[PDB]
Amino acid sequence: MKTPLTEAVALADSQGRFLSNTELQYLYGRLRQGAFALEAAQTLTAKADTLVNGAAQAVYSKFPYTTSTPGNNFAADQRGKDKCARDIGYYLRMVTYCLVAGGTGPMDEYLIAGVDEINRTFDLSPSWYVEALKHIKANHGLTGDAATETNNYIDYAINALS
């Protein structure tokens, strides 16, 4: 739960102090952010389906042993590729939620806290989702300020995975 407003409330709350001018600035600085952020969330919602299909294409082209070698984790048959579409769709949707909230807290809460044990026990190499997020950040084609926000955004995703 990291949005700038809840962190201002937590600071005032932890401190026990009443709301102040310092907290107030965040709200109209969340204007510099949000005035492009909601636009970028809508255009990502439009771009979404071709983004997951291209990311699945890039992951399969980078690592052919996934589509070749038979296994539960590997996408040899149909149902593995269905799991891949589910996983990359989850990643893109958490990027959209992270973009709308303004902070990494939805993404940090819904993805990052358990990804190390899941990648350890279920044999999911994180470099696959590295490929997927790099293909998304190359393919999304955001313009101006919104695009810059995503890079800081999607790089945080790769840094949590790597």
């Binding site: 539960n72 809460e109 819904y110 993805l111 990052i112 806290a113 358990g114 990804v115 044990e117 899941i118 026990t121 279920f122």
Partner: protein, 172 residues
Amino acid sequence: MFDIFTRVVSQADARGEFISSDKLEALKKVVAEGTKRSDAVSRMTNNASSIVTNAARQLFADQPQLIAPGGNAYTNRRMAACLRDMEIILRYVTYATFTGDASVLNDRCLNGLRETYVALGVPGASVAAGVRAMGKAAVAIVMDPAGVTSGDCSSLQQEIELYFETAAKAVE
């Protein structure tokens, strides 16, 4: 926290005389079968991880809600915590068949677990199905023989089925 040796001790103390001969035949054959018992425990904990993932993979194939959004084990840390709970239940049932008594199992992990899963909103019947499938794989891993002398572990197959059953029925 009770070994079966100190089960006999505490029962004979609450009686208040010495340990009788019939209990000593029983304890001698316990000593002759505890060989089977202890390393039955360790071959159960040999493939404990693969047992845990296979039981969870079967459970989420049987109940597609728990990986569907809105389900109990949907988000990533809740799914990891569910794997943690299944590992914990397997580890404590492993402790219980190492002690030879279900007292460690009912004493250490099961008792407040029923109220914990009800108060969290966690389904209990899903856990019951998971521990039952996990127990089937557990005896068979121990039961099957790879590089081990043939022997009668029927009691072990027996008692570990009892321990997994007490775990699943106490989860409810």
